[PDB]
Structures are given as C-alpha cells and as structure tokens.
C-alpha cells in the first residue's frame, strides 16, 4: 500500500461521509445517490450496507468501505456508460471542465477551477483537454 492510495481512499470516504462523523449511514448513501440522479429504495440501501457490514452495527466504517470498494472494483459496461452519461450532461461524448465542475458542485466538493482543470489534464490521455468515453474507461479500470 502506497502513500498515494491512502489519500485517494480518504477522499473517497469523505465524499460519502458528508457530516464527517466517520461513519456512512443509509441516509448519506441515499443522498449521494440522488445527487447523481439515482433513486435507491430503503431496502436497496440497507442491502448495500449489509453486504459489507462486518460488525452488524448498521453503518459503514472505514475498513468496511474499503471492502465495498474492492468488491466493486472486481465487478460491467452498462454501468460505466451510465456514469459517463452522469458526467456528459449534454451528451456530446466529451466530459468538459465545466461539466466536472458542475458534478463536483452537486457532490459538495469545493474545488477551485485550476484544480478541476488539473483533474482534466490528469485524466486526459489524448491531450485534447476533454475526457472521451475511452479515457473514462481507462480511468475506471
């Protein structure tokens, strides 16, 4: 495990734990899903927790979250296209800096413009300054 991986895992956890109490509840999961245009039922959310709820306490702590993500990584093409469409708001096939800014603003991450442009440069493979579907695939896998 590298120093790099830990910061990434931390930021991903903090995305969900919007109140910062160090646990992820069904309500936080639902709120994050709805901010991305999804609509999960209470049963689906509980099943999502209980698929990783090692201690049976009804919330997700840090290592259970790691288990959830590692399981999900091992898991699909319909889903990847769905997320792409989550970001390609106007459907032109290229994720722009403006679209990523909009998504970040929806998630609650207060990121500067220069930082979003940095994210685009980091994910951009062909160097056109946008993220196409294939670059998105590369990012996921």
């Amino acid at each position: 495990l590298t120093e790099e991986q830990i910061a990434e895992f931390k930021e991903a956890f903090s995305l969900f734990d919007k109140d910062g109490d160090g646990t992820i509840t069904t309500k936080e999961l639902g709120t994050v899903m709805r901010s991305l245009g999804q609509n999960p039922t209470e049963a689906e959310l509980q099943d999502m927790i209980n698929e990783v709820d090692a201690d049976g306490n009804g919330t997700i702590d840090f290592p259970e979250f790691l288990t959830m993500m590692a399981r999900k990584m091992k898991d699909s093409e319909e889903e990847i296209r769905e997320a792409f469409r989550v970001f390609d708001k106007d459907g032109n096939g290229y994720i722009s800096a403006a679209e990523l800014r909009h998504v970040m603003t929806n998630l609650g991450e207060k990121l500067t413009d220069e930082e979003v442009d940095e994210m685009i440069r980091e994910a951009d493979i062909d160097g056109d300054g946008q993220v196409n579907y294939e670059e998105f695939v590369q990012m996921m896998t």
């Binding site: 930021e11 991903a12 995305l15 699909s76 940095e118 980091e122 994910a123 990012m139 996921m140």
Partner: peptide
C-alpha cells in the same frame, strides 16, 4: 445504482486526491 458506486469508488477519488495532495 452500482454504477454510481463504481464511479465514486474507482476513478474520481484518484483524481480528486491526486490534485488535493498538491498544496
């Protein structure tokens, strides 16, 4: 449903943290 999970647990965090750790 699982798509949003895959997105918010695989690619996006790497970028956000790789840009945030530079400060």
């Amino acid at each position: 449903i699982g798509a949003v999970l895959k997105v918010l647990t695989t690619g996006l965090p790497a970028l956000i943290s790789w840009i945030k750790r530079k400060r």
